[PDB]
Every structure is written in structure tokens, then in C-alpha cells.
């Protein structure tokens, strides 16, 4: 997350900080961002979990904000299900089908309860995206506190230009960047949300997946196009 502002208790209340556990009583290590799409389900990127795909290795935190008081009973979650897309592959530079689902629950077995600091984010209609040039917002702890920024959707035609990414971009992906190339997602934003408006409703359009550099000119951030994974998602969710 290069540039932008720090969020507050009502900014990006769907954001999930995904940590990896360390041996013994050592504090956990931040691993990835994620989005609460259902009270029991967080959507993230598969490449965040491919090394250690067993659910016991992770813990999810919600409701992060400088004005929100940490309550472990309602904001800390164990992972009772870790689902990576079965056709996740690592290419030369791009990830393919880079999406994962985490089913969460508190120590008393409850799911996420909506509050000032914890809300779900709506999924897009099938194959529906905001028009190119739209303002979407990204969020993360990537390259101390939660930040958010604004990027613009970039058309595939523009993105698939040789001096961009060429044929390493397919239509199950979404490109987004700052026209001034000053703001963008970076290392550590992986799995985090790309929020676009669709019918004036905030929508999880993208999942941070990859990119050559950060806010590098002619190279925008690449995202998993969520509108093309609804059938997959709801096949595990409901």
C-alpha cells in the first residue's frame, strides 16, 4: 500500500488481517490481507497459503482501527476451513486462479458479529464489473496501521499491451493503477480487497494477487477478478 491515508473504525470494516502462527508462545507473523464476505467466510489469495495450506497455521483478526478497542472474544478467529482454488498455478510472473476461502470462528465458536468496526462486503453480480476508469479503493498493512488508497480500473486491452504485461494477463484478472503512478498495492497487501462501486454499492471486485514492482510506471497491480469466481465461491459458502 503506497501512499494514501490511514483508516478509522468505519473505513474498510470488512478487512481481515491474516497471521501465520509461530512455534511456542512467540507472537504470530502477518501474512496477508483478506475480506469478510460472509459472517463465517473470509476471501483471500491462494498464493498466501500454498506453502502451508493446513488451517492450523493461521489466525484471523477483524475490526482493526485506531479507535477500536481490541476484544479477543469478538475480533480473534481460528480457521476451521482453509480452501484453496484447485487449479491454482504459479506462472512465470502471474498467479492463476489466485483465490482462497477461510471459514472462521471465535473461541466460543461464533462467527463475525456486525458492529461499527466489523461489516461484510457484497459480492459482485456474475461477470459484472465497474466500468474501466472507475475509482476503486485498496487497503492493507503492506509496504503499522491500516491504510487505504484509490486506484483506477485499467482495461485489459491497455493492460495486455507489450510494454505493460502482454499475454500474462487473462480475463480472470483485473488491472488497476494510479494514472499518476503514485499510488498502488505492494508486497504485504496480497489477498487484500479491491473495492469498486457497482450500482452505487461497494463491492469486492478484486483480490490483490501480483504485479511487477509497486506503483511502477506502466505496470499496474493485478487482481483476481472476483466476478468470475462466484460459482466457485458460493459452491463452498452456501
Amino acid at each position: 500500500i503506497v501512499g494514501g491515508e490511514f483508516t478509522e473504525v468505519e473505513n474498510q470494516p470488512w478487512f481481515a488481517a491474516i497471521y501465520q502462527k509461530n512455534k511456542g508462545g512467540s507472537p504470530p507473523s502477518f501474512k496477508c490481507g483478506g475480506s469478510l464476505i460472509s459472517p463465517c467466510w473470509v476471501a483471500s489469495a491462494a498464493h498466501c497459503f500454498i506453502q502451508l495450506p493446513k488451517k492450523e497455521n493461521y489466525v484471523v483478526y477483524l475490526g482493526q482501527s485506531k479507535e477500536s478497542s481490541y476484544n479477543p472474544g469478538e475480533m480473534k478467529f481460528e480457521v476451521e476451513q482453509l480452501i484453496l482454488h484447485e487449479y491454482y498455478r504459479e506462472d512465470s510472473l502471474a498467479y492463476h486462479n489466485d483465490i482462497a476461502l477461510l471459514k472462521i470462528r471465535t473461541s466460543t465458536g461464533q462467527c463475525a458479529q456486525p458492529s461499527r468496526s466489523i461489516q461484510t462486503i457484497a459480492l459482485p453480480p456474475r461477470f459484472t464489473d465497474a466500468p474501466f476508469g472507475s475509482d476503486c479503493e485498496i487497503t492493507g498493512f503492506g509496504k503499522k496501521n491500516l491504510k487505504m488508497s484509490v486506484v483506477k480500473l485499467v482495461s485489459h486491452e491497455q493492460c495486455m499491451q507489450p510494454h505493460y504485461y502482454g499475454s500474462e494477463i487473462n480475463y480472470k484478472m483485473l488491472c488497476a493503477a494510479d494514472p499518476e503512478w503514485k499510488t498502488d498495492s505492494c508486497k504485504g497487501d496480497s489477498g487484500g480487497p479491491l473495492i469498486c462501486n457497482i450500482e452505487g454499492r461497494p463491492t469486492l471486485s478484486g483480490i490483490v494477487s501480483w504485479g511487477r514492482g509497486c506503483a511502477e510506471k506502466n505496470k499496474p497491480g493485478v487482481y483476481t477478478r472476483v466476478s468470475h469466481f462466484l460459482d466457485w465461491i458460493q459452491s463452498h459458502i452456501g
Partner: nanobody
Framework: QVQLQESGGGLVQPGGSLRLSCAAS????????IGWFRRAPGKEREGVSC????????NYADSVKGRFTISRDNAKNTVDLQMNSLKPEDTAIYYC??????????????????????????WGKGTQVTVSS
């Protein structure tokens, strides 16, 4: 091999004082917020007093404000609870609990202490404090 261990439990006269200590073995307690919770006969677990990892932030239940004092030594790997002006109402099993507070939240440990300690990572076996004539 992580262990939390309370000590200092005993029998004291009403109005007397008593000091509890929580010690950790197998890990560094200083990274953790610590809470003292208690269960009296019949009632449910309640937060008595809590303190952040660095010790900068504390919280007390109204019942014990001005009577109890929580403190810690991150060099010696301990957290203490000083109890003055003890009342019969204070009779209970006192537990020590530790929880790592992720970055990105408020500095307060109030919500950590007001919620009966559900979700707290580590727990001691507890020590008995009895106030009686």
C-alpha cells in the same frame, strides 16, 4: 511448553492486603497484555485488572478501583496484582491470562478486561484468595 503460573493465594482478614504474582515459562511474557480474572463462588468469571505489554495502559473493574494495583516487570517476566483493603466480596479463585494484541487497534485494554476474558490465549491454573473473619 508454554506455562502461566499464579502465586500468592492465601487467607487474609477483611481490610488486609495480599499480593499476587504471575510468572511465565517457555515464552516472553513482555509481548503480551495480561489480565487478572476471578471467579467467586456462584458467579461467573470477571475481569479484575488488566495491563498492556509495555505497561503503558491499564484498566480496573469498578469494584476494585483505588484498592487494587496491577504492575509488571518485563525483565523478570512477571505481572503483579497488589490488593489492599480486601473485602469478603473479593473471595475467589484468581486467574492470570495472557493475550497478544495485534497492531492496528486502540491503545486501551478496557475491552480486554470487561468481557470475562473469553478469547484470552493463555491461562494459569489459578490461585485462591479468601477474605474472612
Amino acid at each position: 511448553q508454554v506455562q502461566l503460573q499464579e502465586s500468592g493465594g492465601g487467607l487474609v482478614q477483611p481490610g488486609g492486603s495480599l499480593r499476587l504474582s504471575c510468572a511465565a515459562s517457555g515464552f516472553t511474557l513482555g509481548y503480551y497484555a495480561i489480565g487478572w480474572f476471578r471467579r467467586a463462588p456462584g458467579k461467573e468469571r470477571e475481569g479484575v485488572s488488566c495491563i498492556s505489554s509495555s505497561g503503558g495502559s491499564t484498566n480496573y473493574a469498578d469494584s476494585v478501583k483505588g484498592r487494587f494495583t496491577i504492575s509488571r516487570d518485563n525483565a523478570k517476566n512477571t505481572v503483579d496484582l497488589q490488593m489492599n483493603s480486601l473485602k469478603p466480596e473479593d473471595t475467589a479463585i484468581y486467574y492470570c491470562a495472557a493475550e497478544w494484541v495485534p497492531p492496528g487497534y486502540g491503545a486501551t485494554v478496557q475491552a480486554l478486561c470487561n468481557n470475562a476474558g473469553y478469547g484470552m490465549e493463555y491461562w494459569g491454573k489459578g490461585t485462591q484468595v479468601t477474605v474472612s473473619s
